[PDB]
Amino acid sequence: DRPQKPFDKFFIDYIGPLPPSQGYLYVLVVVDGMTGFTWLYPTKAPSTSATVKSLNVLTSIAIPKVIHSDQGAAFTSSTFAEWAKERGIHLEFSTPYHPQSSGKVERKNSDIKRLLTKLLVGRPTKWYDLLPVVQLALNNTYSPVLKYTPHQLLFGIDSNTPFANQDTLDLTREEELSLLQEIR
Amino acid sequence: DRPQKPFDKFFIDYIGPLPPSQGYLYVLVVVDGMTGFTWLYPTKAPSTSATVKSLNVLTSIAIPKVIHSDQGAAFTSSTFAEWAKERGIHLEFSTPYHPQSSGKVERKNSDIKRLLTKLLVGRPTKWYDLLPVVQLALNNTYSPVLKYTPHQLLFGIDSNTPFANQDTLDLTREEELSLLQEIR
Amino acid sequence: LDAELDQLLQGHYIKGYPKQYTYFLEDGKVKVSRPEGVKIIPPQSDRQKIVLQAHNLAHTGREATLLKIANLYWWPNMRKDVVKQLGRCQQCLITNASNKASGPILRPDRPQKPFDKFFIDYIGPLPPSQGYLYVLVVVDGMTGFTWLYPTKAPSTSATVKSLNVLTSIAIPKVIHSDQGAAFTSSTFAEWAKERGIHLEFSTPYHPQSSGKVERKNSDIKRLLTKLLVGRPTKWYDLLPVVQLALNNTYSPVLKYTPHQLLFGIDSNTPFANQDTLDLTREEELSLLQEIRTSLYHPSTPPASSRSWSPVVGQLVQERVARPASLRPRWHKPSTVLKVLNPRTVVILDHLGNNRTVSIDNLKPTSHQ
Amino acid sequence: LDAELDQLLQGHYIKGYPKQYTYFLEDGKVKVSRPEGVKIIPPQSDRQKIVLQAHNLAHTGREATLLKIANLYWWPNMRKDVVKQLGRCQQCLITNASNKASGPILRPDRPQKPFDKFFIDYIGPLPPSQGYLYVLVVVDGMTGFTWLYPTKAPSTSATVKSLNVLTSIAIPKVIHSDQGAAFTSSTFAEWAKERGIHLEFSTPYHPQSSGKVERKNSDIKRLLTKLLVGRPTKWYDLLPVVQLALNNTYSPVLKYTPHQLLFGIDSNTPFANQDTLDLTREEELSLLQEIRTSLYHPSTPPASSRSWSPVVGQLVQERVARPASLRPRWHKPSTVLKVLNPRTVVILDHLGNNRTVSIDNLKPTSHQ
DNA sequence: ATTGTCATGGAATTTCGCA
DNA sequence: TGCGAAATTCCATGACA
DNA sequence: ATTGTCATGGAATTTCGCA
DNA sequence: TGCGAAATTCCATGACA
Numbered sequence A, B: 001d002r003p004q005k006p007f008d009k010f011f012i013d014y015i016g017p018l019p020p021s022q023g024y025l026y027v028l029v030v031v032d033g034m035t036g037f038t039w040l041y042p043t044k045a046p047s048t049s050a051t052v053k054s055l056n057v058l059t060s061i062a063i064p065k066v067i068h069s070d071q072g073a074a075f076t077s078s079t080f081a082e083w084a085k086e087r088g089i090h091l092e093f094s095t096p097y098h099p100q101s102s103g104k105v106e107r108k109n110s111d112i113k114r115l116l117t118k119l120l121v122g123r124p125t126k127w128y129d130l131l132p133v134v135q136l137a138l139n140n141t142y143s144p145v146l147k148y149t150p151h152q153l154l155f156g157i158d159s160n161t162p163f164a165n166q167d168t169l170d171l172t173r174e175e176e177l178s179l180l181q182e183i184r
Numbered sequence C, D: 001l002d003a004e005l006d007q008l009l010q011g012h013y014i015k016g017y018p019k020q021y022t023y024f025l026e027d028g029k030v031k032v033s034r035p036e037g038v039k040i041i042p043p044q045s046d047r048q049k050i051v052l053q054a055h056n057l058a059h060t061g062r063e064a065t066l067l068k069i070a071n072l073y074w075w076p077n078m079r080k081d082v083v084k085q086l087g088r089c090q091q092c093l094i095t096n097a098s099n100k101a102s103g104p105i106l107r108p109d110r111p112q113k114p115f116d117k118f119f120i121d122y123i124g125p126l127p128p129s130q131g132y133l134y135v136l137v138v139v140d141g142m143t144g145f146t147w148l149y150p151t152k153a154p155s156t157s158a159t160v161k162s163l164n165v166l167t168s169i170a171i172p173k174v175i176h177s178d179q180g181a182a183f184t185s186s187t188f189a190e191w192a193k194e195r196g197i198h199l200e201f202s203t204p205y206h207p208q209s210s211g212k213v214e215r216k217n218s219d220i221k222r223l224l225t226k227l228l229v230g231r232p233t234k235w236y237d238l239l240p241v242v243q244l245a246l247n248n249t250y251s252p253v254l255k256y257t258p259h260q261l262l263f264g265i266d267s268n269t270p271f272a273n274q275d276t277l278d279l280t281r282e283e284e285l286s287l288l289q290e291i292r293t294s295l296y297h298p299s300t301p302p303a304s305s306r307s308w309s310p311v312v313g314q315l316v317q318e319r320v321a322r323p324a325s326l327r328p329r330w331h332k333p334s335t336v337l338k339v340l341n342p343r344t345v346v347i348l349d350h351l352g353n354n355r356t357v358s359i360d361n362l363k364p365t366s367h368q
Numbered sequence E, G: 001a002t003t004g005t006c007a008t009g010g011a012a013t014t015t016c017g018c019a
Numbered sequence F, H: 001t002g003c004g005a006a007a008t009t010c011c012a013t014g015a016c017a
């Protein structure tokens, strides 16, 4: 059986609703299974249409053999199925209520949620502008299990943005204060 | 003493007033002494200004060493003298009342007057348009004395308009009738 | 299809399939273990579709198309199938560039006499000068002698007016021009027929054909520019000056000026040559006739290493004259009816017309 | 002047005047009987004026000027005096064309890694498509991998927006661009400094310097044109298609596609290569590192037989960028301060500024 | 049914002046 | 009957919208 | 302070299949 | 151990406003 490779499988999911930012409410999260490389796309809704529009950008750079997702409405529509079929992409669903991916992907998704939460407090409305820096951060984060970052596994070179300060990701006393205040 | 050449001497004179034709009243006549080649220029007046304007066209094709003329006002002005001086052209005047040129030139001028007179009767107003054909006729007329036309002596080749019918130049019974009628 | 591939699996030799390789079945497909790896051998009836899919990804040429196919497939003589499809892709045929140069230029003979052939053309629009915007340039072919006329437009009417003035001196056998609107009108055709002048037109969009006058246009503009340095561009009054200056300028290769070639003696201009001062006019004219016949004439240069020359029956494509943005630069293929000379051809064009066309505006259709 | 010519008439030898010829007086002028005829020898103090009058008739070069003078005059080493005046005629220096070709092009090394160097440029204006008129084209130097962005204008603001999207993936060390307004603004300079990106600019008016991306612009337009044949030019929706198609097209000389050079493995696109199916990712990445270092690199071609290469201190003239009608094509002479490489120089320009300039936009000033 | 051209200035080559 | 320098010829380069 | 590039399809050259 | 044909490599040509 053949070793795992980039583009074998993309894991997709929505995060949100988030506070409005340049009119956007959600983030479509795409994580390559083998490398852990993350791509993020702002959408106004978790619809099939927003997903197709966002994945059309990604799939004009690289096409996965398989897309894995939960049974969200956007992903189980006959339109989304037609879209995947047109591109020779197999669709793969976790069973309802039992979301499952891989350790690496789960950990990566956890990182994404935590990094997002941390950077939105103080500026819950400015995340649109921060999405690039977030992805670079995620994609230049060292993998304990594999000896390499997603960038290194995807491109086979070091990056020009090493993120040397592997960070807290934890909310400080101040940030918990204003995060418990923002939900008042 | 050196043989005579084209551009050695141009003989110039005015003919007119003639009946108006496209606003023009006179013809400045230029005849090269050696070849007998004729150039004609329509003017609105026998002034220095019209002469300079007409000779500026000719002298942008070829410049004579000497211009010969009678003592017409246009030719004896200090302006016309300045013009000639600027172009290194010597001016030459016949003594008043005694016009003299050369046999060839005199004969050529006679031909010009006669050809003009003949072609204007019937159409005294259409001569402007005929000036080209007149010059070609004159310049492709065989010279009894020299064995060649002005065209041949000027360019050293036969022309594409030989004028085979060396013509009457005399006014017919009809033309004398309407020429004596036009001055009524 | 299946017949061929069936005989193959049971180990019988089919021409084109080398016997030394092991052809097997797997996952429902005929396969072969080749040096570069295992490839699928599709049935013959499938191959055109495959070639077409691979080609259509980015409308690639021979190698780039083959390289895609070879990733998954092997069959005999794949490039022959690729080329067959290349030769039928309309979109490729009319959009791709040529990679063959035109054959070496002709150097037509200098017209034998002054007034044998005029070359005429317009320069402009130029900065307005006394309300004038253009120059009619008339160049005598044999001599290089040139006449300049300022005009308001590059019209038939202004051409006729200027030439009525010029032909006061002499009538030329032939007037050569490009296909500018001024020169191709029926009014200009009549004007010339009235005078016994033959009109000769350049192939379309090929100014080199009017090269005699185009080259003079360069000298005219170059001298005008020099005379106008640091002054406003009041060029109208310099035309007469430029005309005289150029008509009396030596060509270093000829050792004569155009004036000299026309008249055989300098007029009263600065630095007039005086070598024939002691000849009679007839002796002078006789030397002139000799000088005229022995001028340097250049010869056709070497072909470039990858030129093409047109052949009767060949498929060739004419360049699109003014192609719109994102539109092909070439017309659909057409056939060479007649080879007028190695640089000029009649083709049966993209509609149904005969067109006489420069080889510089043609490419040979690729892939036969 | 008179001294020299006096000694001559009384038969004493002056250097430069061959002794075997008979120098006499006539009509108040010193003369000489030379093979081609009798010529006037003007006094030294008259010669500059003569050369200048002859030159100024039509602003002729060496031979055509000499030929005029030689009609009337002889003196020693006339061409040296002609050339001296040629070298001082401002009007000639700035209007005449060069007759020396630039030295052979450099082939700079392929950037060692993806993201070392981006080349960016605008294509357009194109026919309006969804209100868009331009494409930002971003080409990775090492790989050839290309990103396309539709924009409404070739603005800094649209560049920044597109690059914020692109640099989500990775930040390049260097971005190379031409001097388009979009790229030379202080807003774009800040945008790049904020990110640790070095901006590298082409010499002015020299698109060959952005050749990596210019060449991709060709492929982009060529594919768009093909896909739009017989349809209206709705190009907006084809950008993604063209991007993917080109990024997965083989370069025949390399035997790789840009996608392969960036990722070392094909994604799920048609005819995906499968040779490394049994390698681990690390083995694959290791082969990729090898593949990257051994790509074909072309070399500097032969100089043409009459090229020039710039030397510190040389007088050279910069081409006028957008010369008005009837205006010189060249600036006044300037001096080469520094030879950056054989094709690139710093000059002390026509005002008083340092300018870094391509040799293709320079001619060496004639006549020293 | 038509077709490149030729000024330019360094370099290559020839001729000139003298012996 | 040869030399050094000048004169002439060669000819690639580039521009004629 | 910077620098040409590379798809294309015939032709030239090398390799392959077989003996 | 050499042949004929196919496959691969060479590379001039031309277009990137």
Ligand SMILES: CN(C)S(=O)(=O)c1cc(O)c(O)c2c1CN(Cc1ccc(F)c(Cl)c1)C2=O
Binding pocket: C121, C122, C178, C180, C205, C206, C207, C208, C209, C210, C211, C214, C215, F016, F017
């Ligand atoms: C630009 N066009 C409209 S055109 O059809 O090509 C056209 C039409 C005309 O009437 C012209 O006089 C000229 C042109 C182009 N051109 C400049 C040019 C370019 C390359 C060369 F080799 C030569 Cl020789 C001359 C002309 O002088």
Ligand SMILES: CN(C)S(=O)(=O)c1cc(O)c(O)c2c1CN(Cc1ccc(F)c(Cl)c1)C2=O
Binding pocket: D121, D122, D178, D180, D205, D206, D207, D208, D209, D210, D211, D214, D215, H016, H017
């Ligand atoms: C026409 N100008 C305004 S420009 O200053 O010269 C300019 C400015 C830009 O920003 C460009 O992208 C381009 C250009 C010219 N051009 C076409 C071209 C021509 C010849 C070549 F060798 C190459 Cl490589 C490309 C460009 O693509």
Ligand SMILES: [Mg+2]
Binding pocket: A013, A014, A070, A072
């Ligand atoms: Mg979900």
Ligand SMILES: [Mg+2]
Binding pocket: B013, B014, B070, B072
């Ligand atoms: Mg009088």
Ligand SMILES: [Mg+2]
Binding pocket: C121, C122, C178, C180
């Ligand atoms: Mg024209």
Ligand SMILES: [Mg+2]
Binding pocket: C121, C122, C207, C214, C217
């Ligand atoms: Mg023209």
Ligand SMILES: [Mg+2]
Binding pocket: D121, D122, D178, D180
């Ligand atoms: Mg640009």
Ligand SMILES: [Mg+2]
Binding pocket: D121, D122, D207, D214, D217
């Ligand atoms: Mg460009």
Ligand SMILES: [Zn+2]
Binding pocket: C055, C059, C060, C089, C090, C091, C092, C093
């Ligand atoms: Zn195609």
Ligand SMILES: [Zn+2]
Binding pocket: D055, D059, D060, D089, D090, D091, D092, D093
């Ligand atoms: Zn000058």
